[PDB]
Amino acid sequence: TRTYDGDGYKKRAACLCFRSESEEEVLLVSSSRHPDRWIVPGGGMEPEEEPSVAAVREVCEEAGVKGTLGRLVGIFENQERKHRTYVYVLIVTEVLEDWEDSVNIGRKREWFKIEDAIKVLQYHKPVQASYFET
Template structure:
């Protein structure tokens, strides 16, 4: 395989996975906020583990730009539309070989029924930021890290990106999993 390839495609049932030149799966996601204060975030139930919450997002399709993929994934998984804001960062997960472009989206429309609610029974729920970090930490520490990048006022430092929108080295957040989680007794 040539090292000059920008991305590679791999067909999987019902989807095409795209990979960058370093073999990382190309993904996009949005932190969906109720309003500009960015104090409540929308999480969705995992398709694999319906009792666990995740940030809506998924694989990029061939020829799809990260911002378009993020908006598409949020509509499919969470049934919301909104105003796409800033790129929070590009998060690299070494364990699963994913690179995820994470954007901020302010929700302006919430559908009663949406693709994943009808097809797989997916749920959605609003969380305060600190609560969302807590529920994500044990099973999706990379998703918890997205929220940690927000400052207490909800804003971030703008990530370093090139004119073409690609991240510079400073915009990539490296996240290692395998963190110990403390769970409260129920």
């Protein structure tokens, strides 16, 4: 069930899933519709779902990782697609081998240096590239 702010923007949550507290390497996942593209794992908040809970749930489903939830980075609008996304830091402590989207749609995941994550997000996902700007 998709949820919306009062202005009709889709409510989303995502995590910057870092390999370590150094925040040098981040986990991206393949696009479901376009598997040759990389995106930040995240997705729609459910009714009455806290954004931090939605963020952790979505990165479990999409990326097959768990870890220590860190700070809210910010709230990022996508004016073109009418999304409003809460973005959190997650320090990955668990990497699971056969996760929901790997089983269901063969979703891929890969570690990127921050600079390279920004590079591969820029063309299709410039708002997700901006998640890293701070």
